[PDB]
Structures are given as structure tokens and as C-alpha cells.
Design a protein around this nucleic acid. Sequence first.
RNA 1: ACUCGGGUGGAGGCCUGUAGCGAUGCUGACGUGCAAAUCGCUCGCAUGAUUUGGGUAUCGGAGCGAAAGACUCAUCGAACCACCU
RNA 2: UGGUUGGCGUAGCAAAGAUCUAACGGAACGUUGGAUACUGGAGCGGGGAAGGAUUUCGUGCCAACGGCACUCGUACACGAGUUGU
RNA 3: AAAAUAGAUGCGUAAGUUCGCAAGAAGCAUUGGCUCUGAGGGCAACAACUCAGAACUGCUUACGGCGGGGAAUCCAACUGUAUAAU
RNA 4: GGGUAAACGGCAAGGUAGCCAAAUGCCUCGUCUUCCAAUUAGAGACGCGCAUGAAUGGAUUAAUGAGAUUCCCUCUGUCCCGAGUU
RNA 5: CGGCUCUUCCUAACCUAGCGGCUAAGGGUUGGAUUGUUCACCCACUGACAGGGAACGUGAGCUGGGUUUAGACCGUCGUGAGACAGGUUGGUUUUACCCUACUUAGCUGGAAAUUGCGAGAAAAAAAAAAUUUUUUAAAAUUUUUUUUUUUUUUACUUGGUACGAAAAAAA
RNA 6: GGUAUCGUGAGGGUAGUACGAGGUACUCCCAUGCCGUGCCUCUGGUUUCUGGAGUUUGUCGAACGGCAAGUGCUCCGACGCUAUCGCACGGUGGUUAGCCAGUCCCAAGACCAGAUGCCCA
RNA 7: CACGUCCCUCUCCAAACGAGAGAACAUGCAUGGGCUGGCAUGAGCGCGUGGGGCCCCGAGGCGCUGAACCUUGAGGCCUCAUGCUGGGACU
Lengths: 127, 397, 150
Amino acid sequence: FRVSLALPVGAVVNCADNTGAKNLYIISVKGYHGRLNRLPAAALGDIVMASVKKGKPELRRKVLNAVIIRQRKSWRRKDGTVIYFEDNAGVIVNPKGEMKGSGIAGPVAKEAADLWPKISSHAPAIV
Amino acid sequence: EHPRHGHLGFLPRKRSRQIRGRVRSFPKDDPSQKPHLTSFMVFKAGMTHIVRDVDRPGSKVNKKEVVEPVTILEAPPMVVVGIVGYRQTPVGHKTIGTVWAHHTSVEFRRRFYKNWKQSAQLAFTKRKQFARTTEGRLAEARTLKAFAKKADIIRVVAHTQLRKLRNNRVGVKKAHVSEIQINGGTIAEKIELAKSLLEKEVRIDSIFQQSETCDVCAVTKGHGFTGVVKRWGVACLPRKTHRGLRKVACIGAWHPARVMYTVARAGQHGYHHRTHLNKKIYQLGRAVSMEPNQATTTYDLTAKSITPMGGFVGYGTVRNDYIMLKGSVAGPRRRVITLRRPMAPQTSRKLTEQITLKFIDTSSKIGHGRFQTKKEKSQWFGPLKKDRIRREERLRK
Amino acid sequence: SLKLQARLAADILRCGRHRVWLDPNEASEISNANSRKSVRKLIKDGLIIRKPVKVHSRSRWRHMKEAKSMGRHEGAGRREGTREARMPSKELWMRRLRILRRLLRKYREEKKIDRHIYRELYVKAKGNVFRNKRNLMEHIHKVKNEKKKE
RNA sequence: ACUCGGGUGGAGGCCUGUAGCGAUGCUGACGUGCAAAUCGCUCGCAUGAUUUGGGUAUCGGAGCGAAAGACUCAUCGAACCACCU
RNA sequence: UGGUUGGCGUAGCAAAGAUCUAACGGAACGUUGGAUACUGGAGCGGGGAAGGAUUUCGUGCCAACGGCACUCGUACACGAGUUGU
RNA sequence: AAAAUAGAUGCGUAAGUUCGCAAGAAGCAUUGGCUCUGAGGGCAACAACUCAGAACUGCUUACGGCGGGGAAUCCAACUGUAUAAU
RNA sequence: GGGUAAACGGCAAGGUAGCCAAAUGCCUCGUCUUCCAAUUAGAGACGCGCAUGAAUGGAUUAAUGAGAUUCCCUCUGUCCCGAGUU
RNA sequence: CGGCUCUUCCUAACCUAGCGGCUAAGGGUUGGAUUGUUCACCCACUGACAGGGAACGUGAGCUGGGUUUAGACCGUCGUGAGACAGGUUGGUUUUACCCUACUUAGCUGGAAAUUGCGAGAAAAAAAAAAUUUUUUAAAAUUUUUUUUUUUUUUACUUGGUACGAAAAAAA
RNA sequence: GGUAUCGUGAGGGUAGUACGAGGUACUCCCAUGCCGUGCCUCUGGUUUCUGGAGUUUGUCGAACGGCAAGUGCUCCGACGCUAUCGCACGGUGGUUAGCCAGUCCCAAGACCAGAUGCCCA
RNA sequence: CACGUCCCUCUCCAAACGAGAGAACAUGCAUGGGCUGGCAUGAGCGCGUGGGGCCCCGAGGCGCUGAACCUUGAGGCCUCAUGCUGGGACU
Ligand SMILES: [Mg+2]
Ligand SMILES: [Mg+2]
Ligand SMILES: [Mg+2]
Ligand SMILES: [Mg+2]
Ligand SMILES: [Mg+2]
Ligand SMILES: [Mg+2]
Ligand SMILES: [Mg+2]
Ligand SMILES: [Mg+2]
Ligand SMILES: [Mg+2]
Ligand SMILES: [Mg+2]
Ligand SMILES: [Mg+2]
Ligand SMILES: [Mg+2]
Ligand SMILES: [Mg+2]
Ligand SMILES: [Mg+2]
Ligand SMILES: [Mg+2]
Ligand SMILES: [Mg+2]
Ligand SMILES: [Mg+2]
Ligand SMILES: [Mg+2]
Ligand SMILES: [Mg+2]
Ligand SMILES: [Mg+2]
């Protein structure tokens, strides 16, 4: 559902992913219809064009995709349960949405795990 | 270029000329229906939330409890005090006339005064002595002939019973009078509902029912001479801006050589009339004395009351019938909000949904309020020094 | 309107206006006191009084001056000043060296120590080869027993 | 052969920073102002080619200038006063 | 050149934190007491230069002036006042 | 523009360099309260108040005041002066 | 007639050492490389230099700079996108 | 100049919609790196990133980056002072309290739109109930009788009003 | 003629939009974005309740209690305000997507012989 | 002069001021209580670094003590309890 937008373009979310990316730099949010001055903003479950800013050089200087799997910006469940994370990290992923890592680090959000069938499986936990 | 800031059909944004939130248009009359009243004045109390099991094929929440906010609207029965007929004319509806009830509660006659108690209190005094006489009974009889004949619209003139509201904060004692249209069957049928119901109370539960929606109309909360940034939502200017930030930088051009009605300007925001649609009725609620275990759902059995522990802030206990409807309702707490039968088609999959509440909330509004019950709070803290300094006194007596 | 006497009382009470006290209850008798000599009569006569200066106690400080002696309020968070501002190196060196030059000078005077070794130590005292008095106090002892053996 | 410790000492158109002298930025306040140039914070120098009182010397086709045609009594790419006019 | 005008009882009189109380005074702001703050020794402190030149002081006054008010004033009026081997 | 750095102590401190510097480079670190201890002198035959240490204990990280830093290029070597009023 | 360019100046002589799209390069946002997701910017190279160049000083320079300029870390209401309080 | 801000209008329609290129101005038409820019080009998103007008919309709205006077530097030109639409750097952005527009906010008049008495109704053309018939003060201005309301002694949300009764007053 | 009340509604404003998924290639669903109209239960922000606590220096002889530091500073903090940072809602009919009407907003200078209550010396 | 409106006064769903909504002897206002919340365990007396000569000094700690205080005020709740209760203008 609605997930209050957390990670505007320019954000540097961490890479939770198995890969050698250390952190992602959000470049733009896929599916972002734009109002005028508004910055595109990734939120939980969103695919994101992101360049690794730190980590293995092979990943370092190309735009990459990444779904956001956790988020310090808290959001409200339809269940009425506002919730949030210690950190907001994403995982690198294909345009298809298959994830390129072999295993996600920390907890993955419930609506990361539900949009992304593969992300859900590698997730150590769902939240 | 970006879209316009603000809806131009809500304009002028001026103070409403009333506060009672009168219905602008009643839903279209349907002869096939049996006669009924189309609206009901109610007093906004406060909000809570409820848990509910959405059971809506599709979505990620079907079969899953969801916390909806609800507004509670205390609804003491309105009293009908007169009928009104309208006749269609090429220039538009004209009142045929009205038949007042043989008797009128003082709260109603308070309404015709600015200072009732220092008045001679003569309102409806000639009617009272004339409706009694056969001369005035035949005259009242003729008005109904005119309704059954020339009318297209029958309307009850109902009012709120503030005496019965017993709210300590809604300071009014003038009754909130208002015509409430009778959509229904043939005009004789509407007259008949109208006159049998011509001095009786009218509970909401007759006009409405649960899970059905209601359009609301109430003046929205007043904000005074609001500025353009709060009034229209325009972007405030960059810090470096000189004359001031909170302005529309360009309120016009060379031509047309004047400010247009469309550029945003500082002025009254709030306290505008609004008709908001499709507010689902999560529960009609009977008066606390009659049905004390309000807010006690099938899945939450503790005897309980719709009013929070601190009472509603600024309003207090809901001592009466209450409509509990989903989401926000325009207007401040304790404003009187007319709420009509829906004018929308109401055949939506959502609107038709039955709403079985799983948990009315009753925690304090005031602080966070982690207790649903005054009994449960005591069941947490247990006895404490206010009691020991109380219990000891009782033993001494 | 006895603003003149208050000018006068303040002068002959040898204080400020702030301290002089013209009795509120007898403005009239004060009121006809045109001369300093009139006002002096009013001062002995009690219509005019000098109030004690408003107190400024040091009791909070003396109690602090106890605690500071016992080492309270001393540590890293309680130090604005550089260790040199807070206690100068030149101040310590003088005290250290005035003390050494004096003890070398006391022994030379009682000739506990040779007028020879005095240069031997007067000049080492200046190169702080001696941390303290009792460092030099024992060096004079051990620079001397080395001689006692022979 | 004259180097490595450690102290000493208090140097410098040295540093941080008061006072004082300035006056960068906000292109902030003000902008028919408190002010015919001010206010605020910020900032620069602050042992020096420093700042400062008094006195004294040098001026109008002239004086004086670490030089901007700057300043020479709110007047300067030629002061001000009167006069020719 | 003089006078008058609309704007207009308007724009403003918003820099430096502040007064409160009782009693008295008075025709109605001052005075005293108390309270309360402030300045905060590079001071709304105490003395001087330059400059000013009666502003000093007392009594009275408050017409005008003290951009509100004044019963108060650096204002007005009257009387005083500055002492050296 | 704001924020930010910030005092002291102990560590640690790069390039480049005219060998002076750069440098407070940078960068971590500890800091309260309390009850104690140690050190550091004078005059004969009592005086400081800094440093140091130790336990115990506390933190809501809680006055004021107090550098943000680094890597480079252009220009001028430096301090200075200077268009009072862009 | 002679001498003189740390005279004015040129490059009678034909721009040497250097240095550059430099505050000096029109063409031009030059080209290459480096920086970014992307760079008319920057740095570094290159040099058909419209029109660089030697006390009209050339180049290079540590320290200095309320100088110009680029980026970085930190930081933040600059911003997303405004809200609340005084 | 530009931007920002805000509104608005156009269409030789970019997307959306309907068709089969046509109609269609409705609503929408992104976020960034470089550069003052516009523009262009790029990166990313996007359903798409269309083109324009509004005094090349919009400075008593701002910003002041461009242009940018005096200061200064460089190149070239000039014997020189100085010039260059060449580059570089530094370079006060004033006033609404008027009128109107507008935005809210009030007050008061007014229909021969303030007057005339100058007269127009989206009215009706003995009354009510089931066009015609029946019912609603009577008997000799006053008196009597009847009906309705107010005061006192079950059904309505449940304090206060209705009908109950009985008496008094009015028609 | 006052005063009051309920309404009428000429006229004017006017708004919803887009995307995606499902389901089966329309219907029908289900979310979201934008827009818009609100609202403040929750969640976040906001504190001059200077609420409560802690705390620093000065100060009140001290404890207590304060007080000054132009709200001293730190923590928590109700009311309230507010955020697509929370939440609710965004409807039809008729004509040729338009357009008009409606719903929606202002609505008698559109001067409403509309109704109505009261008094009309 | 009628009815009444308005002012003054009180309240606030209103509010720049007008306007608005209300009140008009009314739990209206006021305190108090109860409550709902907040904070977080008051004052005061009665385990402990060590220290001084069985007590004293001792930050901190414990106990009474979810205590103390605050809780409607630009305007939380409760009638729970007590307290206090028209003039002018206009036609
Ligand atoms: Mg500005
Ligand atoms: Mg609440
Ligand atoms: Mg120096
Ligand atoms: Mg400096
Ligand atoms: Mg010049
Ligand atoms: Mg004024
Ligand atoms: Mg002070
Ligand atoms: Mg005098
Ligand atoms: Mg005089
Ligand atoms: Mg800055
Ligand atoms: Mg080195
Ligand atoms: Mg220089
Ligand atoms: Mg200047
Ligand atoms: Mg280069
Ligand atoms: Mg040259
Ligand atoms: Mg300098
Ligand atoms: Mg233009
Ligand atoms: Mg203009
Ligand atoms: Mg007339
Ligand atoms: Mg009150």
C-alpha cells in the first residue's frame, strides 16, 4: 500500500545485499510520475536507479537498480501499525527485479518481500 | 508549468453565512421508495479509531484487521415541529406554506431570539392559540390541501434538542432548526409521514443505518485571515527573497492588466461550507443510559463507552445517540453537522460493504492513553496513595 | 516632594541615594529640612537612616574554597585554561630554581658542602638535572658521600 | 670534527582573540531611516609600515597621497567665498 | 513669495530587556516606603580636556518646549552660586 | 544563509617546504560528582594551589565562551595600504 | 657618425628558454584523459598560440589571503516541503 | 537576459481519449550534471517529457548569475591619454500609506433603482371536502353554551413537553 | 414597518486526474501517484502548560525554595496547531472528448408578493 | 412606546478589527474534588568510596514514595462540592 516516501533522489541508502556494493546512491525512482519541484523519492519496495558510491569498483560507476528493503522513514500499515527501521538499505537488482546478491543482510520489510518474490526468499526475516 | 494551486469551485473562500451546515441539495426523490427523512443534524464529538476486518476481494488486506479513524457524532433525536411544502415554479421552488406543530419546545423558540430570557417570549404564541381554534384548524387544513395539491417537495422543519444533548461545552440553547426533506412516495404519502411525525422525535437510526454512507455538510474549522501559503498551498519563496517569503511572487501580468480572480490571495481560510461524500456509518449508537456497553464489540467484550477516558477533549461524554462514521468530518469538535442521505450512486463495491467492528478504541485522547478503560487503568496501577489516603479515612468514619 | 533632602541625606550619610532611607511616614517634617544642618538633625532624629549595603555573601565561595582545597572541582572538564595559563611554566621554574639556588646557598653557608661543588650543583640546578628540593637534597647527600669514602 | 636529549629564555611588520582601529559577507535591517552612510550579526588587523590627543607645517591652474583621480570642513577629473556676472 | 490643502488622525512614535504597590501630592505625573529588575568597574559610575557657557543651585512654574504625558525638566521665571602664597 | 567545529589533557599529525614551517594539519581519546591518596615549599628548634593518582558514583552528554576540515587550480610572495558614502 | 633596449618598444631583427584554450585562445562547450548517473565547470595533458613569452619581466614557488576557482568530508530547512513556537 | 514564483490563453497534438491520418485544448507534460543563461547537449524517470502567447507574461514580487559605470588585470589596437559588441575580477536593486484590480471583512440604503401619490404578483379570482353539497351563535346586542387550555393532583431519550381531569375563560 | 427564522436560486464559480496490477480482449475489480476538499484517532513535527525532571555558572547566609543567564542548557512533555510525514472523501444526467445541466462553492443589486414567527405606539 | 435588536458584561465551534456563534440566574463564573494525562519518585526526616575521634563527616543509595507537582488556561473531562452572583442605546 501507501508507504510514506523515505529516500528522495540524492539519498545514500546502504546495500543490504550480499554483493560487494557497500552503499547505494539513489539516482531516481522507477515509476515516478513527477510533480514540478518535487524530488523523486524511493520508499520501501520501490525499484531505484542507484550507483554504488562505495564498494567494489566493478559496480562503482554505472547506474544500477535496487529495491528498498528497509527504511528509517516510518510508515503506517493499513493494519494501523506505524513501523520503521534502524537503517534504510536496499539490494541491487535487475530491471526484471531478480536480485543479484545471494543473501540479504538484515531484516527485509514486509512490503519489500511481497513485491519481490526473490527478495523475500533471501531475506533473513520479513517485517 | 505545474497544475493550479487550489480548486476554483470552492470560491470565494469566505466565511460561511451559517454554521449549522444546511444541506444544499437533497438527494433526488424516488417515488418507488417508501417515504423517509433525508438528513439529520448531529454534533461532532471527537475522533477515535477502530479495528475492522476488511473482507474485500482484491487488495493485500482482505481478511485482515485495519485501523480506521472514526468521528463520533453525538446525535440527540431531532424534533419535527413543522411541515413545509414547495411548489415548482418557472422561476423556481416557492414555499407553499408551513404547518407548525401544535406545541414547540422552548429550545426551538429560543431560536427566534437573541435574548430569550429577557424577552417577552411571545414566539408562536398566536399560533398556539390559533391552531387550537377551529378557524385556525381549517386554515391548517387548507395548507395541507395545498401541499397535497401544489407541492413537489415536502419538508419537515426539524430541530436539535440541545436540552437533551446535555453537553457542557456546546453552549447553545437555541435549537438548531432546519428543514429536512422527505424523499419517498407520492406527496400524500410524504404529507402523511410528515404529519404523523409532526411533533415526534426522530432518531438517526431511523434516518440512517450502519454501513450505509452519509454526505456530511458542516462549516469547516475556521482559520481567520489565513495567508496564501496556507490558504492555497503555494510554494513559499527562497530564503534570500526580500519583501517576504510567504507570498505569490507574481499575482498577475501586464495583461489582463489586473489581478485575476484565479490568482491566490491572503484571506479567510476555514469556516467554509462543505459537502463531503460517502462517509460510511460504522455504527449508530444508542444513548449511554439505554445501551451502556457501547464500544463493546463481539470481539471485545469489556463493557465500555464510546467516550474516551478523559471524555472527548473539549466536548466530554457522548450522553446520547451517536453516529460513528469513518474518517474525518469537517468542522471543529462540538460543531453541529448536518448529514444527509447519500447523493452518490452508492452501488460501489466499497460503499455497500457491511462493517463489523472488531474494536472501538476508548483510550484517552489527552496524552497517549494506554488504557482502554478506567477499570483497566486501576487494574494496572492497582491501589495507590490517593486511595490509601482515602481508604484510611473511610475506616475512621 | 522631598527630593532635595534625599540629595542631602545621601551626601551627609556619605553614601548613595540608594542606601539613604527617608521615613515614608514623616515626609512633612523631612519636607521642611532645607539645610544640610536641618537634615543632619533629621538623621540623628531617625527620620532619615542609611540602609546597610545590600549583602554579597562569600559563604558559597568559602564552602567552595574548602572543596577546592580537597581537590574537588579540579579535573579535565573543569579546566578552561591551558595548563600553562592555568599555572605558568616560568612560575614553576622560578620557584623550582629559587629553591635550588637557596638550598645550595644554605649548605654553602653552613659548609655542609664545598664551595667547589656549589658550582658543581649551582650550574646543574640551572639545567634542571634536579627535579625538586629533595632530589637535590639527596644529590648533595650522595654527591658528598662519594667524597666521604675518600 | 658538533651533533642528539632536556630545560632556559621570550623573538617575531608571528598566531587566536579583547580594547581600539577597520569593514568582508549577509548583496541582512534601514532605505522619505536613528543616520544626507546608520544598525545587527559575521568578519579583518590588533607589538606594529599599529592606534590615538594636543600642537605644527603643506592647499586651489594648488596641496597631499603605500596612487583610488583618492582626500583637501556632507563640496574635488580642480575647495569654498565674493566678484566680473 | 505667503497661506492653505488632499493624502490623514494616516505612515508611523516597534534598536537597548521593566516596572509593580501603597501612601501622599496634585485641579488631575512627581515624592517616600516596599517590591522588582537593570547598569555590571572599557558601567545609563566618579573626575577632566575639547566644546558648550549658566545648562549649575533653590524656590516657582509648566503658557510654549521636553515628537505620549507630566504635578516633573537641561524648559520658563525669580533669586542665588564659582573663594587659592 | 544556516548548521557545523570548538575548552583543556594525553596521543597522533601528510604532502609540499625557502627547513622557519605546513600544524590547532588531519585523526582518534579522556573530561562530572564525590570520598581519598601522592607530589611539589617557608622559617625556625606555619604557608600556598597547581599536577597527579584512586576508588566510589552520576549523566537527560544538560550554562557561557570557544577553530569546521581536507584535496587542488588562478593571482599576489609575505605584514601592510587603499576608491570616507556601491 | 657612433653608443644604448633592466630606453619606448619589435620579434633592425624575425619569438630563444619557457609557459598556455592560462585572468591571455576568436575558432571553442577545441581534443584527449580525469572527476559524475550525467559536467559548457574543474584538474591534468596537448599546442595550427585569432593575439603567450621573458624587469612592457618568463617560469616556478613553501608561507600568507575576509582574493578567484573546483571538488571533498562533516553539516545542516538550501532543498524536497513545509510545519510549529517565541 | 535569465531564472524563481504564480496565473492565464492559444494549438500547425507530445501523452492521454475517440476513431480510421482525422478529429480532440479537456487534463498532464519529470528530476538532475555542465553553463548566468535561453538554447543545446547529456543522466534518470516517465504515459509523455509538444510547441507557444500573455509588453520576447511576471524587478515598488524577488534574485542579481548574465549585461553590468567608476577600481584592477590580460590579450590585441593606439605615440599617448585611452579603445576592444575580447577575456578576467570586484562592483548601493529605493517608495504604496493613493486609485483601481484583486482578496477576504463589515455597514447601509434601494422597486419612478432613493422622487409620484406613476397603481403590472410566475397570487388568488363562504369554505372545505368528497364542481357540488353540506356545515359552520342564536334569540329578542346580550346571554348562554361549548370547546379549548392551563393548572393541579401511557409514549415519547428518561426532568419536560403531550395528550388524561376539572374548571375557567373566551368565542 | 420593524425584528427574527426557515428557505428559493436567477447569476457566477466549478474538478477530478493518471498510472498499475488483477480478472476476462470491453465489463468488473484492487492499489498507488497527482490533484482537490477536509480532519488530527493514530504517527511524526511543534512547547511560552518555561508542565515535570535533570543540570551549569552567578545569586538569595544555608538546606528548602528560588532566582539571573533576554526561554541558560539537556530530557520527557499534554492542549493545540500541523504533515501526502498521519487520516477520511472526491456523485451524475443531457446533448454534440468537448459542451450544457447537476451534484459542489457564493448566492436577491436576481431587490424573492417565497414561507414563517412576533409586535405593529 | 410595543415587540425586539444592540451595547456593556460572560462564553467560544468565531475572530486582524467589525462580523460570528452562544449565554443572559445559566454548573454561568470561581475555586476545590474526582478523572484523564504529564513527568518521574518531592520535602522531610530515617546501604555507602573513604574519612575523623561507638558514633559523627560522606556523593550516591534506600524506605515511606507511580511519589511531588502539574492537569484548561487561546478556553481537557465529571454536577462531582461548595462559592459568588442586570445597566445603558435604539425604534
Ligand atoms: Mg535581499
Ligand atoms: Mg490527543
Ligand atoms: Mg601580529
Ligand atoms: Mg585569522
Ligand atoms: Mg583611472
Ligand atoms: Mg497608526
Ligand atoms: Mg545585571
Ligand atoms: Mg536644575
Ligand atoms: Mg532659561
Ligand atoms: Mg556561509
Ligand atoms: Mg614533512
Ligand atoms: Mg597581496
Ligand atoms: Mg567604498
Ligand atoms: Mg587546463
Ligand atoms: Mg605582455
Ligand atoms: Mg593582508
Ligand atoms: Mg520580459
Ligand atoms: Mg511589476
Ligand atoms: Mg420609493
Ligand atoms: Mg473559562
